Specification:
The protein is α/β, with parallel strands linked by helices. The protein folds into 2 domains: 202 residues, Rossmann fold, CATH 3.40.50; 119 residues, GI Alpha 1, domain 2-like, CATH 1.10.400. Helix content is 45%, strand content 13%. Strands 2-3-1-4-5-6 form a 6-stranded mixed beta sheet. Strand 2 and strand 3 form a beta hairpin. Helix 1 crosses helix 14 and helix 5 crosses helix 6. It is globular, with a radius of gyration of 23 Å. The structure holds guanosine-5'-diphosphate (GDP), sulfite ion and chloride ion. Guanosine-5'-diphosphate binds next to helix 2 and helix 12. It is classed as signaling protein. The entry lists the keywords GDP release, Computer modeling.
């Protein structure tokens, strides 16, 4: 292990009376466009490094799960009208109406056998499925399929959200979120918006929604900024799972008209990676550390973060103070 050898070369703890107990601090900036996966990464840090989410904590997210699900089905049904897409079985029009009656009379997210029934039949309808598959034409939660396909479990009277259910939530976050965790004896200070490292998140599946080019313009700015010269810049190309499902049927050319590679996961994901890394104007001075992630996948984030941490250890320790 080169990172272990590297950190063992430090001597600054010896300048402190109780140096071996001192906390080495790493400030990490979590950046990226809305819905790029920043909150999800923060949640994985709690899960992997700080003992996860207990059941009682998971119960607090129940009505958020309900709310996300309701939002999803409504967005699809409403889009059917704008896109002129007919129901398969014409009796679903009553279920569509009933969905609005129930959502319209309620205080917040909820679930009943009646609502579950309405939504199940809607999600199973061929016309609804056809509208769902044109989601790129409107605005729809990426977890729409996840919750809807599992509606039966979510709908049970004694339903308790799983960690995956909580990770899959979209929560309206405002302002700056700061989280703290210890890993490999490093005391991380992570800021979801002069720093040790930046993690920049990109939603790969946004390519056909222009979102990707806005993500690029933002990365161009950040990557090449003055304050970040000695900052380790990490690129998370996220939602690789949604990208892989989607790249089979929707072409990269929608985002990058000049693209002439095959429309496969391997070629299209590589191309995207190059588009972002090429935005680095100091190529011989700064390296970009790129990882393809699925932020909802605890194992993948654990692995990826372990590698991101070895890079910080080999590269940035000298600028990390003791406290
Ligand atoms: N399938 C999938 N969903 C993801 C991934 N990353 C984030 N999400 C979901 O995308 C939505 C937005 O993510 P979020 O962390 O809130 O983005 P933020 O605005 O940058 O904080 C949430 O519902 C997440 O559950 C991913 O890699 N794969
Ligand atoms: O001294 S290093 O191991 O934080
Ligand atoms: Cl989303």
């Amino acid at each position: 292990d080169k990172a272990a050898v590297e950190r063992s070369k430090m001597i600054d703890r010896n300048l402190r009376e109780d140096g071996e107990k001192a906390a080495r601090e790493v400030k990490l900036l979590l950046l990226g466009a809305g819905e790029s996966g920043k909150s999800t990464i923060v949640k994985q840090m709690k899960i992997i490094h700080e003992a996860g989410y207990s059941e009682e904590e998971c119960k607090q997210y129940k009505a958020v799960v309900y709310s996300n699900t309701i939002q999803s089905i409504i967005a699809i049904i409403r889009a059917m009208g704008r896109l002129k897409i007919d129901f398969g079985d014409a009796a679903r029009a009553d279920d569509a109406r009933q969905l609005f009656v129930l959502a319209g009379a309620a205080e917040e997210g909820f679930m009943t056998a009646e609502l579950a029934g309405v939504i199940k039949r809607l999600w199973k309808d061929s016309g609804v499925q056809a509208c769902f598959n044109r989601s790129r034409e409107y605005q729809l939660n990426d977890s729409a399929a996840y919750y809807l396909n599992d509606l039966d479990r979510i709908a049970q009277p004694n339903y308790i959200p799983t960690q995956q259910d909580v990770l899959r939530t979209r929560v309206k976050t405002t302002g700056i979120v700061e989280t703290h965790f210890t890993f490999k004896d490093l005391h991380f200070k992570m800021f979801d918006v002069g720093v040790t490292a930046i993690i920049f998140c990109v939603a790969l599946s946004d390519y056909d929604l222009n979102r990707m080019h806005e993500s690029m313009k933002l990365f161009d700015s950040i990557c090449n900024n003055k304050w970040f010269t000695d900052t380790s810049i990490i690129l998370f190309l996220n939602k690789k799972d949604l990208f892989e499902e989607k790249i089979k049927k929707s072409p990269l050319t929608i985002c990058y008209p000049e693209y002439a590679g095959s429309n496969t996961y391997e070629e299209a994901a590589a191309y995207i990676q190059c588009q972002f890394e090429d935005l680095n104007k100091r190529k011989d001075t700064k390296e970009i550390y790129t990882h393809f992630t699925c932020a909802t996948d605890t194992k993948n984030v654990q692995f990826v973060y372990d590698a991101v941490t070895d890079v910080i250890i080999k590269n940035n320790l000298k600028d990390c103070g003791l406290f």
